[PDB]
Amino acid sequence: QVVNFGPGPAKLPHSVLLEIQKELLDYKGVGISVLEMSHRSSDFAKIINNTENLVRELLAVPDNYKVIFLQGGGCGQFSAVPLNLIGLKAGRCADYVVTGAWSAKAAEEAKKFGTINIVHPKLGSYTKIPDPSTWNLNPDASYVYYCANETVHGVEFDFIPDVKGAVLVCDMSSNFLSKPVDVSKFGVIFAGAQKNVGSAGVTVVIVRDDLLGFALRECPSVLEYKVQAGNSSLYNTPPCFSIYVMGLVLEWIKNNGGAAAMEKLSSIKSQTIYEIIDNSQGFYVCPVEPQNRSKMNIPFRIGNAKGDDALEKRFLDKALELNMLSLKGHRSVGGIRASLYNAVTIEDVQKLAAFMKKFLEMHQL
Amino acid sequence: QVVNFGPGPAKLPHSVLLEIQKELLDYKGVGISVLEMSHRSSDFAKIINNTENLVRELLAVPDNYKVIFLQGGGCGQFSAVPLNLIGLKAGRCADYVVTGAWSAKAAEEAKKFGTINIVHPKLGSYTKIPDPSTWNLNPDASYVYYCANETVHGVEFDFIPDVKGAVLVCDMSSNFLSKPVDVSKFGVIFAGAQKNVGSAGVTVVIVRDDLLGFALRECPSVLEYKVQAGNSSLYNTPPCFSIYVMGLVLEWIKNNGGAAAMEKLSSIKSQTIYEIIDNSQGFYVCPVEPQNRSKMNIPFRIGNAKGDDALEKRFLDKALELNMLSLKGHRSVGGIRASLYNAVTIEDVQKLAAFMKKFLEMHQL
Numbered sequence A, B: 001q002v003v004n005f006g007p008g009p010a011k012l013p014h015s016v017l018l019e020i021q022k023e024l025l026d027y028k029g030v031g032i033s034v035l036e037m038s039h040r041s042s043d044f045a046k047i048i049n050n051t052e053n054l055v056r057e058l059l060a061v062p063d064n065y066k067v068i069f070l071q072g073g074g075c076g077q078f079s080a081v082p083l084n085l086i087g088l089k090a091g092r093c094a095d096y097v098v099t100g101a102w103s104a105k106a107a108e109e110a111k112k113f114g115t116i117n118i119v120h121p122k123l124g125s126y127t128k129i130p131d132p133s134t135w136n137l138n139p140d141a142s143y144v145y146y147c148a149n150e151t152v153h154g155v156e157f158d159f160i161p162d163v164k165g166a167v168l169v170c171d172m173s174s175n176f177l178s179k180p181v182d183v184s185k186f187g188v189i190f191a192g193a194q195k196n197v198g199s200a201g202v203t204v205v206i207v208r209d210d211l212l213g214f215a216l217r218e219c220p221s222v223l224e225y226k227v228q229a230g231n232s233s234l235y236n237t238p239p240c241f242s243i244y245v246m247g248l249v250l251e252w253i254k255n256n257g258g259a260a261a262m263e264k265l266s267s268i269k270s271q272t273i274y275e276i277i278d279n280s281q282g283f284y285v286c287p288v289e290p291q292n293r294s295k296m297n298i299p300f301r302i303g304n305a306k307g308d309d310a311l312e313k314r315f316l317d318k319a320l321e322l323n324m325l326s327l328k329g330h331r332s333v334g335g336i337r338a339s340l341y342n343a344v345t346i347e348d349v350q351k352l353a354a355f356m357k358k359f360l361e362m363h364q365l
Helices: A014-022 A042-059 A073-088 A101-110 A225-230 A240-255 A258-278 A309-321 A346-363 B014-022 B042-059 B073-085 B101-110 B225-230 B240-255 B258-278 B309-321 B346-363
Strands: A065-070 A093-097 A115-118 A144-147 A168-171 A188-192 A203-208 A297-302 A336-339 B065-070 B093-097 B115-118 B144-147 B168-171 B188-192 B203-208 B297-302 B336-339
Touching: A014 A240, A042 A065, A042 A203, A042 A240, A042 A258, A065 A073, A065 A225, A073 A093, A073 A101, A073 A168, A073 A188, A073 A203, A073 A225, A093 A101, A101 A115, A101 A144, A101 A168, A203 A225, A240 A258, A240 B240, A258 A297, A258 A346, A297 A309, A309 A336, A309 A346, B014 B240, B042 B065, B042 B203, B042 B240, B042 B258, B065 B073, B065 B225, B073 B101, B073 B168, B073 B188, B073 B203, B073 B225, B093 B101, B101 B115, B101 B144, B101 B168, B203 B225, B240 B258, B258 B297, B258 B346, B297 B309, B309 B336, B309 B346
Parallel strands: A093 A115, A093 A144, A144 A168, A168 A188, B093 B115, B093 B144, B144 B168, B168 B188
Antiparallel strands: A065 A203, A188 A203, A297 A336, B065 B203, B188 B203, B297 B336
16 A cells, blocks of 8 residues: 655565565575675676666667666765766866756865866756756866756756856756657766665766777776776675665566657656646746746745745645655755656556545645 | 575574565655665665664764775775775885785775785684784884675684784774774774674674874765765665665674674684584595684585595585585685674574485485
8 A cells, every 4th residue: 555755765666676686595596695696797797687688678778878786875976977987188177067966066066176166156946947048168178067857856957058168967867767868969878776776775877989998097996987888897895785675677668668668657647746736826836947847856935935844734734644755845945745756657646636636625624 | 494504695583684675665664665765865864874873882883983884895895905904104004914805805906005914924824813923014004904804705804903003904804793803903893794683785884083084085075984974875885675675684783693692602612513523533624724714604624635526515515405405614724614794693504514424324325
């Protein structure tokens, strides 16, 4: 019955958790657990190769791109991206687009490795994507960074920005494989697996193969793109079980229609919630401009623009009573947040939709 | 019927794999998998705190020591230790003890962050520990680094070396919680979970609380001891499932007598194999001096000291027919290597003992 609206780590498909359970003591007959499996064995080589192929297949990754699986999460890439790329041009400058909490954290972290310049004026509220025409781009910048989907504020790019030919780095942790992606436009894409593509413990990084070999001296070898691509992500012991779980979710996505189907399913899901908000007559307020609304994370308030705390606690308390978990908004924003990642089914959103309507039908004045 | 002598990732207790399997879909009745569990939930807080408590209990870690769980494996700490500690003193020097392959790698990685002086002359063969009284120690070095147990060459410290008051850092990946440890004599202890206390994906680090706040600017935030100790290993998403698995293994060690019992069980196991080698009349050759022989990894050759390729293939071939996995020595050394970590039972070792005895009785000249 439990409906898991978790923001990350999130819900995994039930069929995947069933297979992990039944294979847990004897993976496909070899007689051991994946938790016991050597990363140098023929069996795990087949696991990590199939996981990489699915990333290339589902996203249509061109052959001039490496696909490596690192540790440290997305916040690790907040340091791995500058350590690997900020020396690409001698100036060691990088231009950053800050559309929410995770772009801000990444921009601040990069200040530890070079001079970071935010290309747009500071926004009073994380409610819109600054028009790319307003971007003040440095022609000598080593790269340009932006976050595809801001998990805390629900601001998402439905376009790949024009960065005047500079190398493009994109944080796609919260919408990875929720839609097709023109990988050819990017220099580095990274995404933590714990939102749309697996369990916590592994990060997928897609790097253009000529962007290796610019890493700083202080870059840890386990986080250097050049080192890990040359060892097929096996420079040291990889998160074997996380990569095994990730490949199963990737297989689940492929059986369900790939990135194209995920885009359609995430449209039906997000539209179901935005439809309640847009016709709520101010009872639900979503502050994001409609043309930048995320299809993965829908944060909103109850009552008014700043939110009525008394009504929102009653919403969450009744929501928890119905076994709908992790609907509380992020600590820094409060309010409500619904995360509708790939594993969240339509029936799961249909339960949330029915509850929001009955709650609105009981408290609108 | 599989006997798993893996070097890391290694064997987990059958009891632990059963509980992980039973609760994989509905952990302790909360309705979700740990793979789906949020790191901000009350449920995960119980897990990671109990995991931290068990490390403190089983090792008797003093209160002035932080216990943190990081990503990146042991090779991750090969960079995190210099980044966090090489700047204790302004010289940015560090003394390293190279007793095998893993201390050799850590010494080379540290050269990326400072001037590294290896305290002793090159050994020519990794068969002994250089005498600590002959160690050329730098009084202005920031710390002294050594690997307690060399997994590839089978050289293990049965003592804590006197570094004349320097901050002592130790790589205990391959013998962590195989014996009691006087933590007070160390500044930093770290260990990858996959060898003796769990599954790959998480690394435990024990740091004295006065050694924080010396990290270099280039240290990634997810690898900075101060940042991660201040957030109780929750600066970003931790390897939740790997920390969950480790807590069950630690609970298993506690139920089986703690570190004190692990030490004596490790003696029974290693003595069973080392005596077979010592009475083999040269049919089995272990080149490590007996006073430095590892109790965790026993590498040896068959036929003669340099190795009989024909006999070693049949040994590994017949061992595979009998479902004894991962007995092949490391790629860099060849020969045979038997890993006898905590979950490897005396019953497991007796199968290796009987087979080694029968192979000697059938090919000794």
